Amino acid sequence: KRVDFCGKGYHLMSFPQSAPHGVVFLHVTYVPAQEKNFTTAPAICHDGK
Amino acid sequence: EAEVQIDRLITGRLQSLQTYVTQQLIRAAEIRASANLAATKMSECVLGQS
């Protein structure tokens, strides 16, 4: 849940691999795209509530 | 005898230099640890919520 600890973006899962004198992690990460604009509002009134 | 005197002076200055270098190495390692902690705090507390 801590951001940017494993990968750049939301983290999903990882796989370790060996090396001659170390370890190599493959991180699977989720990244959004294709945005839009819309118009927002914080709350909606109805019947005074 | 000039060579004797120069030998003594070189020896002493050399130990002084080596001591200074070793102290610098220790301090640099400590600063590196502190800056790594600072980078972690910056990347975790600012870009998101803790």
Side-chain angles (χ1 to χ4, degrees), chain A residues 15-27:
Chain A
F15 314 112
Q17 309 284 267
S18 182
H21 280 320
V23 74
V24 164
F25 290 89
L26 316 179
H27 297 301

Side-chain angles (χ1 to χ4, degrees), chain A residues 3-4 7 9 15 19 21 24 27-30 32 37 41-42 44 46-47:
Chain A
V3 62
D4 212 4
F15 314 112
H21 280 320
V24 164
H27 297 301
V28 182
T29 60
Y30 173 87
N37 262 341
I44 284 180
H46 170 241
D47 289 342

Side-chain angles (χ1 to χ4, degrees), chain B residues 3-23:
Chain B
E3 61 87 18
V4 191
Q5 314 293 335
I6 301 299
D7 189 358
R8 303 180 78 96
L9 284 177
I10 297 169
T11 44
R13 295 185 187 179
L14 188 153
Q15 291 90 21
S16 79
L17 192 40
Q18 272 184 171
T19 297
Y20 164 68
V21 163
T22 289
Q23 303 290 346

Side-chain angles (χ1 to χ4, degrees), chain B residues 8 11 15 17-18 25-27 32 35 37 39 47 49:
Chain B
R8 303 180 78 96
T11 44
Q15 291 90 21
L17 192 40
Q18 272 184 171
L25 277 171
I26 310 295
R27 216 154 293 135
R32 208 266 190 279
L37 165 62
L47 307 188
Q49 208 185 22

